[PDB]
């Protein structure tokens, strides 16, 4: 069904990325000079920090300039809603392309079809494109991460001659919020050789990685960054978090961290260019 209040499509998890990319390229979207994915995290409330706003404004401006694809969760609650609102504002002012990928089961209201979705999770209507994964139907745990990672890896495998970047289209992961899902996404991106940029100074896991960029120090940083999260998390959760931290830090050159001191203009662009 097409949400109107863009295009929302329900696709199974076991879907070949090649077919989706061919569909998008043939008649829906043009070749993408750049592609950036943002992992907001489990939290549905995004704190409008003094610095995060400018960072993401610069990110969206860069994406518009380069005609990039912005991938997010698409949830109307949290950072994704802010990104969608900023995309709509820029559109009101070359078209920006935003894809929100989520799980159909977690969606609160399901409308089948040109059915219109009008306001359990809620998705932002600002996003121009949306994808709903459905393998564990009516399943609380998130399952879109696998498809997102597979699609990102396939797009990395692609090759565009027009782009100045040699061969494959550039892809940059982004991490501003903390959470287990964010850490898993960072691990998958690192295993995929696609660089990720972590916003140091904001978020729990992001700041932990920034400080790391051993095991006891990692645990102490994780506890300090998210006291409530570490207190609620069990010992097995802490062990898994430390394992993922060690796995991601094994490849430091890929990950890039924005310095807390660095707060000038065009810092996001500089960091992304350095990572690429």
């Amino acid at each position: 069904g097409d949400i109107q209040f863009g295009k929302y499509l329900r696709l199974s998890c076991d879907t070949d990325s090649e077919t989706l990319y061919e569909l998008l390229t043939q008649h829906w979207h043009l070749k993408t000079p750049n592609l950036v994915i943002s992992v907001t995290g489990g939290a549905k409330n995004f704190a409008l920090k003094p610095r995060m706003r400018k960072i993401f404004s610069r990110l969206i401006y860069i994406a518009q300039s380069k005609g990039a694809w912005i991938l997010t969760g698409g949830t109307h609650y949290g950072l994704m809603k802010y990104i969608g609102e900023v995309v709509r504002d820029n559109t009101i002012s070359e078209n920006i392309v935003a894809i929100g990928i989520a799980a159909w089961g977690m969606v609160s209201n399901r409308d089948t079809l040109s059915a219109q979705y009008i306001m359990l999770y809620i998705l932002d209507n600002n996003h121009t494109h949306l994808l709903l994964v459905d393998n564990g139907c009516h399943g609380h745990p998130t399952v879109e991460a696998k498809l997102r990672n597979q699609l990102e890896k396939y797009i990395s495998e692609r090759t565009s001659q027009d782009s100045n970047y040699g061969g494959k289209i550039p892809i940059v992961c982004f991490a501003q919020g903390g959470g287990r899902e964010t850490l898993k996404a960072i691990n998958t991106s690192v295993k995929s050789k696609i660089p990720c940029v972590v916003v140091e100074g904001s978020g729990q896991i992001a700041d932990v990685i920034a400080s790391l960029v051993t095991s006891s120090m990692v645990k102490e940083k994780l506890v300090r960054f998210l006291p409530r999260t570490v207190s609620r998390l069990p010992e097995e959760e802490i062990e898994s978090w430390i394992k993922w931290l060690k796995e991601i830090l094994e490849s430091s050159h890929l990950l890039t961290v924005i310095k807390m001191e660095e707060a000038g203009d065009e810092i996001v662009s500089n960091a992304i260019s350095y990572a690429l």
Binding site: K54, D89, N90, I92, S93, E261, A263
Partner: protein, 81 residues
């Protein structure tokens, strides 16, 4: 006494009067007087996009006005500390 009156620039006042005259002659039946007589007899018988653009330019203006504090050497002192 007259030198003081002429000290004040009349350019702004003339521009104001120009606006008045332009409004008078624009919101008016654009016909010459010889042919305007029949005009009276004949007479007797988007926004959201503009406001959004205004808000965007407001965001840019607010950033520009708030950058003034950037020139202060406080940031360097904080980095040093």
């Amino acid at each position: 006494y007259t030198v003081g009156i002429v000290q004040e620039n009349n350019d702004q006042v003339w521009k104001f009067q120009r606006y008045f005259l332009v409004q008078e002659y624009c919101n008016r039946l654009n016909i010459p007087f010889p042919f305007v007589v029949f005009a009276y007899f004949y007479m007797v018988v988007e926004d959201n996009e503009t406001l959004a653009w205004e808000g965007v330019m407001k965001e840019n203006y607010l950033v520009k006005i708030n950058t003034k504090a950037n020139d202060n050497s406080e940031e360097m002192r904080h980095r040093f500390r």
